[PDB]
Design a protein around this ligand. Sequence first.
Ligand SMILES: Nc1nc2c(ncn2[C@H]2C[C@H](O)[C@@H](COP(=O)(O)OP(=O)(O)OP(=O)(O)O)O2)c(=O)[nH]1
Ligand SMILES: [Mg+2]
Length: 331
Amino acid sequence: WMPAYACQRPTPLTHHNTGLSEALEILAEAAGFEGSEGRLLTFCRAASVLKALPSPVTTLSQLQGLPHFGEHSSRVVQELLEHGVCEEVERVRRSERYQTMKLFTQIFGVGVKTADRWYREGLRTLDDLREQPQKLTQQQKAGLQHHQDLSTPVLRSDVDALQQVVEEAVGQALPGATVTLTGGFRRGKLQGHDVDFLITHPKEGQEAGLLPRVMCRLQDQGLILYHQHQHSAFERSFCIFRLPQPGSWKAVRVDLVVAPVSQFPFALLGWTGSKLFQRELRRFSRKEKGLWLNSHGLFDPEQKTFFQAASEEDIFRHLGLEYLPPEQRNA
Ligand SMILES: Nc1nc2c(ncn2[C@H]2C[C@H](O)[C@@H](COP(=O)(O)OP(=O)(O)OP(=O)(O)O)O2)c(=O)[nH]1
Ligand SMILES: [Mg+2]
């Protein structure tokens, strides 16, 4: 038996069912594009189960006794095993709606609702968007300007170089302040779409005004192509960095998040993901333990209290879960 919630089981970075999980995740993504949130979550959960299995699924008899494997997800896997291909998945892959929604939603600053609006309005290509600049936010204009680099996978080598410049800037602005790599790279991923850093300082309040100073330093080194600073709920800067490379450079998306140290463990847990892992952890918290978990805290709605955590381990323990290190949160 395998546990129901993704937060009750390890899900490693690498697994034995990548074809099958990829196919289910296409159907999940397509569901999300049509605003079908139930169906998205259902396909995502089924894919997550396959990622946690210790062996490849070679016959359909191997699906027995697994949670979150309803009829639809089972049929998809059956067709893949029997025929090498699933007609429904192939139809989605080839469909103009899916291809265009994927194209648009990938762009920096574009979500499903915006992409769907553009689709409905007859826009299909990146050139179409460039022909209608009045339809674009400044963030989206920047995403289009750099779209080729931003759809080139970010590599661990890029992350190391970025972490060095961010750490240098943070250390020069405020000795004692720290930078923690989060997101998929903290989970062990070799590649990604962006780089996530969480900044804090051990004395509560000493992080105030730090991010604009960090950004000034980075901007004055020529490292920033785009920056949008927002005070609000954590202070954050949504950035495109200009990463120097041997003979050239590439644009890379970087999010910088500042958390006061009291909230740091919650922020680190939240920002480390995976997105499905954290959704599952929050559902577990609410449904099984009666507590509301988010990136800022863990709230008991009946007692009107907040849990004091020094680490992620504290939070897992308080929720009655075995601790999972970040590399086992790849749900
Ligand atoms: N708690 C919380 N988490 C967030 C928020 N926004 C993003 N995250 C989480 C979900 C992600 O797993 C993680 C970083 O988001 P990403 O889109 O970078 O995902 P991740 O880095 O895991 O995959 P990637 O390889 O970058 O596509 O932070 C937020 O407002 N609150
Ligand atoms: Mg990331």
